Amino acid sequence: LCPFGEVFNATRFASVYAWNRKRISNCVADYSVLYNSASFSTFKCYGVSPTKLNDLCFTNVYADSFVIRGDEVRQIAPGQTGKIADYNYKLPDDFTGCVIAWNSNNLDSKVGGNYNYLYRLFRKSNLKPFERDISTEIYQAGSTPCNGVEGFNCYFPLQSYGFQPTNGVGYQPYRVVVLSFEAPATVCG
Amino acid sequence: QVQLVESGGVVVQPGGSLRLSCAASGFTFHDHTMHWVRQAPGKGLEWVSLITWNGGTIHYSDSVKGRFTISRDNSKNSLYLQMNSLRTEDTALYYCAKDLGRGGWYLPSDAWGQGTLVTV
Amino acid sequence: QSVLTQPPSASGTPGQRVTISCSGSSANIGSNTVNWYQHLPGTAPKLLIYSNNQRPSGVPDRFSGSKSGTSASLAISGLQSEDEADYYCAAWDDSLKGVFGGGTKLTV
Ligand SMILES: *[C@@H]1O[C@H](CO[C@@H]2O[C@@H](C)[C@@H](O)[C@@H](O)[C@@H]2O)[C@@H](O[C@@H]2O[C@H](CO)[C@@H](O)[C@H](O)[C@H]2NC(C)=O)[C@H](O)[C@H]1NC(C)=O
């Protein structure tokens, strides 16, 4: 029995700039239990029929997890671009796997703002698929040298999602789990 | 979901003084630099002042230099502007704005407030 | 009576691409970055382009810009009737402080 409960029902999720990867293996993975669950706001699966997964086995199923705004959920898909897709978390054009998300306004938001969850705003170039960059160096915006101390035209690369109980839906927190699917198989239905 | 709310939009007889105040929410306040920007009626946008997060550096536009004072209180998430020695030339819609990132500074960026009309 | 120079107006037919020029001195644009704003009368200004050619989230790829020596421009493609607004150029000056251009009124 695959520990999906430790990936979907976890106490705390990582920030998008530093997302968590848990490898599910040597177990039985029931994917019907998570699909027919009305708790999910979206279940967009790529490469595979979301209903046939319960008949398939795979070699290694990686489960990535992070917290992003509702308006950005559409960026967690192959072929997409955007502030998250390009600098925080990128999927390959030949991605195979499921992108699962749900509203967590009752969990990652509090009165006066939940600013514990960061997201990279500045990066020199677009990152590669499944790359994870957690450097906290000062970003130089112009031709003038910052020397690693914030000041004129140079900024700290991360920002805070100001999550509050009264945010519009687009600005409410969403928890995202991405199940990437890929010799001998170890994860069968 | 960033908001900035300006107040103090009252009419002051020329040669008098006025203080404005800009409540902020929806973002980290203590790590951000902020600015004031004014729009004279029928004209474009003018830059007034920024104050960095730690009060390290403060700069004024030469039109308001020596008469306007900017200050902030990070424990109340509010920005203040004390304008003294008012001139009829200062009639404008005043706006509150923030910078792009944390720590650093340059110019008014993404979140602007609705602003408030000051008549002299 | 302004430091960054922009034409008072611009215009074009929907589906066409138009440009808004901005010019300045060596201490304005030559040696610092350019931001562009879009101001629709009745509401607050927003930030369209920053650091010469970068975009904030919410701004579509119909809006692009560039910097060349001391001059700068904003290119607006696929003109829609919803973009009939006043556009502004800004660069930090070394001797002078924060500079905003006169502003260009773009009409359909
Ligand atoms: C994810 O968690 C929910 C809620 O946790 C359960 O209830 C808690 C009070 C505690 O008893 C936990 O140990 C339980 O796991 C699970 O609840 C499911 O909710 C759906 C929709 O209401 C329902 O159809 C299922 O029967 C519930 N199953 C239970 C009660 O365990 C849910 O199963 C968990 N899902 C995963 C992926 O583990």
Numbering used by the authors:
A (entry chain E): 335 to 516, 520 to 526
B (entry chain H): 1 to 120
C (entry chain L): 1 to 108
From the article:
A total of 1000 Å2 of the paratope surface is buried at the interface with the RBM through electrostatic interactions and shape complementarity. The S2K146 footprint on the SARS-CoV-2 RBD highly resembles that of the ACE2 receptor, with 18 of 24 epitope residues shared with the ACE2 binding site, including key ACE2 contact positions L455, F486, Q493, Q498, and N501. Structural and functional studies show that most of the virus residues that directly bind S2K146 are also involved in binding to ACE2. This allows the antibody to potently inhibit receptor attachment. S2K146 therefore overcomes the mutational plasticity of the RBM, which is implicated in immune evasion, by targeting residues required for binding to the ACE2 receptor. S2K146 targets antigenic site Ia, which overlaps with the RBM, indicating that mAb binding would compete with ACE2 attachment to the RBD via steric hindrance.
The S1 subunit includes the N-terminal domain and the receptor binding domain (RBD) and two additional domains designated C and D. For SARS-CoV and SARS-CoV-2, the RBD interacts with angiotensin-converting enzyme 2 (ACE2) to allow virus entry into host cells.
